Amino acid sequence: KVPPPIHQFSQTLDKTTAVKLFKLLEKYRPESPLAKKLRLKKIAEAKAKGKDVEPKKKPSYVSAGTNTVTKLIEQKKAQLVVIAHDVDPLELVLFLPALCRKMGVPYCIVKGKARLGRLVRRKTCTTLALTTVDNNDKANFGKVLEAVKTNFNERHEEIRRHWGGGILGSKSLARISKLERAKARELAQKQG
Amino acid sequence: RPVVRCPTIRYHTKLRAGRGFTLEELKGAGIGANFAKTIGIAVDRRRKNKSLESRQRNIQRLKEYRSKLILFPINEKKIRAGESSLEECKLATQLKGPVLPIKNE
Amino acid sequence: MASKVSRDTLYEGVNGLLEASAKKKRGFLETVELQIGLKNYDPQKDKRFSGTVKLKHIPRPKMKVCILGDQQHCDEAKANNVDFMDAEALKKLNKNKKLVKKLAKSYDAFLASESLIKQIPRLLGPGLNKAGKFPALLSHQESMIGKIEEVKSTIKFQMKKVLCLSVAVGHVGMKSDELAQNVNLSINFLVSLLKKNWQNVRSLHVKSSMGPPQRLY
Amino acid sequence: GAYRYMQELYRKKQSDVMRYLLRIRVWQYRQLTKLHRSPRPTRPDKARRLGYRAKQGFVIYRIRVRRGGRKRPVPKGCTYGKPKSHGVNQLKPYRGLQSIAEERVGRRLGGLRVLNSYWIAQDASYKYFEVILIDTHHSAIRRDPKINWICKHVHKHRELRGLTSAGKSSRGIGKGYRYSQTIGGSRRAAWKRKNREHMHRKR
Amino acid sequence: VGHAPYEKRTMELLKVSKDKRALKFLKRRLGTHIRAKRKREELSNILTQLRKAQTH
RNA sequence: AAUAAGUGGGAGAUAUUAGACCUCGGUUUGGUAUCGUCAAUGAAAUACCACUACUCUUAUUGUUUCCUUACUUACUUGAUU
RNA sequence: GGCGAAAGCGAAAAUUUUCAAGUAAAACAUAAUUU
RNA sequence: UUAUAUACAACCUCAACUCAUAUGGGACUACCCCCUGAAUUUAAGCAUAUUAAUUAGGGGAGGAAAAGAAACUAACAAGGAUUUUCUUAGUAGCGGCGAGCGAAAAGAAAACAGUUCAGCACUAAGUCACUUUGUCUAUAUGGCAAAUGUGAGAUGCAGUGUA
């Protein structure tokens, strides 16, 4: 019996909609490093003589790092939070979904703690909370956030109330089911 | 070394030689903390001196100094030092005398 | 098994007194009957639940008092329309009846003269402990200033030996903005007569003469 | 910041959350030996709060000690001399386990210093701490001068000489008058200081 | 995190169940008579937030 | 009126009815009413209306040196390459 | 593997990823093998 | 992708290497540091006291070591980091109230040097280290860029900010 803040992991939103969640994230990788380098070396030669302040357009992507994220949740600038579940220990991510009902912001959980770190060029990442509200991905934004509502955020009001968990398993359960299968074979002739 | 007035009823008289220097006195006396530190004050940031005349007691003792303090220039344009540079120690003092009096009781 | 017009368990704050004026579901007059669920307030000792609260609005208690006067009760009492008698109704208050549709114990609270005290347990005493309307000496009985306050809603409550309470204080047919200053001053006038009070009771009970008991915090 | 939350949840031990996250974690933590290296500090944030960053490479070593008293090594019927000196089966050691659990790194590991420590869990047959070692001559650590302090020669092996967390606290160190000896330097270098007679040049 | 079970075991005790010994059950527990009085009333702060918000 | 838990408020409530008004019940007015506040007179003035709670009673999530029984993954005990 | 404040242990260390010697060998931990 | 039926890609715990590249047990000990803690002796005997928080005690350092920037004092007309000396003082209490033990702020003297970590907001990892190729030289486990070649690094690096 793991206490019913778990299972907040790992009932995790079947992967047919989850692959669409990553398709927003394909546009919101933080920075390619040469593209980071080609952006900052243009400061060195062009905008050192250009004296322009407009054409940067700091592109909004999804933020990483746990110590980044829990500012962005509490300052109410975040839009969607993805936290991993294959995680250590729990204390970086245990209390974190509980914030989201009290802070109203829709969140979600994902399978696979490496896949958030596959694209961000780090190793393992565990904390990706989204801020982007742009019109190019505003169309597919609304339908996926309605899906995580009842699965994660409206589920969040009854998830602690219903979990015993920790089934016995499994060969002993066969012997557990053996006697009731035995005694039902006997119960057919008692009242008969 | 500014401090006065040794603790208990054994002493309502004497005054030990100055380990405190009362940060909260200093803003009421024209300083200027870290500038006074490389002057040399023994500026120490932990004493919270409780009495107004003991606040005043070092205040005059501050202004006893800082005037005979001869202000050697840093950029040697000497526009902002700003007491003097013509009172340079070869011209004026070069004393290096020890005793540093504590008003002698 | 509680009622809607008389709440029992649900404890409101300061804004939950506005609907208590709706207890007038009748059309006739109903006298509100206070009661308290008391703890460790034993009546057989000197703790006698007997006094007077001074409700600054008039809830019109139907007050008739025989004013026993010996040159001190009715001299300044013409400002409050006293009966102006010479303390001679005591000779007919017991052992006989006055007239048709009248009893011999026909009041709620009684006043006595200061020099007419030893008669009060002897000739009228044994006929009034059977009524329980016995006037005491601590129930605002001096009749120097106790005349203008007589129509200004004076009550007298006698403590029962079965641990109950039902005495007339006023009514509920008027506005609850009157009752905002009625209960919040009468119970503040109840802290001073009760003893050792910091937190010894959990709630108040308030009941009308034809209604179920409501409960306030 | 998440860390001030996750310390605030670290304290609330006697839960069903932390205890039955200790309960899985504790007898996970025993089929491994008395020593094995790990990559990652189980508490991160109390591997933080301890003078700690995470460059290459601030290693973490699990360690157990045997959770008990200490019995005095004399064979089978105890000490000679005096009845001030009989009693064994309840005698108690002095240095706490949180400074024994860094000697039992510093000599088995011949290569590294010792920085701080923090407990994790406790059950009846071990208490069992972590050790935040520091590398000494990774050619990074010379040019990392906010933690340059520990690789002067006089700070190495700070498990014996008692200047870790607990080994500081073990010898009775502070000021003032709950500590008034020990004051003469270390601890009982008091009790060679004050008995030191000064037969003057000129009395 | 739920409750630390002495607070919960006394949460039953501060319902009606003999507050005085329940208070001394904390000073037996924690226990210093300066520290226990804060941990006494902390339970009632939970209990005064869950007298009518405790419905559903 | 007994048999008023008791004891005090109360010095008539409530119900009914048509009328008044409302879309209407109803409240009110007056008539009537098992009793009664009143009288019947004593230990409580019984109508009207009670906080309380037990003789206890049906039911609920009770901590229990609780007892007894299964469970097994913690742990203890071996076996085999 | 273990325990001891450490030195070291009046010790059938039989538990210690592979704690295999390996073997002319084959993909796809070379095969049953070696405590 | 796990009827225990295949790949690939990560991750996670985790190996093996006559790999690369480098750090450590040891000697001494007077002084110093954390350790373990005995005894004749004194009480006219002895058992708690004492020898003593002591000789072996051994594991650790150095030209310093530990302490040190108070979770202190004192209670006053206040003081103010740590260490040693004079005195506090053979006084306060601990004591088979036996023998005997035993400090201390406060007073004056040398010297004087104050400040980084953790953690809100600090607000584009802006970080750090190898590698190779050159700059620059030098008996440097070296200074400048670069390929942005790795990897470390968000499970958080940096700057500003601390009883």
Residue numbers in the entry:
A (entry chain CG): 80 to 271
B (entry chain CL): 55 to 159
C (entry chain Cz): 1 to 217
D (entry chain CN): 2 to 204
E (entry chain Ci): 58 to 113
Can you provide the manuscript's text about this entry?
Protein synthesis is essential across the tree of life and undertaken by the highly conserved macromolecular complex of ‘the ribosome’. mRNA translation is regulated at many levels, but until recently the ribosome itself was not thought to be part of this control system. Here, we have characterised ribosomal protein heterogeneity across 4 tissues of Drosophila melanogaster. We find that testes and ovaries contain the most heterogeneous ribosome populations, which occurs through a combination of paralog-enrichment and paralog-switching. We have solved the cryo-EM structures of three different ribosome complexes purified from complex in vivo tissues; 80S ribosomes from the testis (3.5 Å), 80S ribosomes from the ovary (3.0 Å) and polysomal ribosomes from the testis (4.9 Å), improving the resolution from the only other previous ribosome from D. melanogaster.
The presence of IFRD1 does not affect the paralog enrichment events because the testis specific paralog enrichment was identical between the testis 80S and testis polysome ribosomes, and polysomes are unlikely to be translational repressed. To verify this, we solved the structure of ribosomes isolated from testis polysomes (cryo-EM average resolution was 4.9 Å). It is clear from the density map that IFRD1 is not present in either the P- or E-sites; rather there is density for the E-tRNA in these actively translating ribosomes. In summary, we have solved the structures of testis 80S, ovary 80S and testis polysomal ribosomes, which exhibit differences in translational activity.
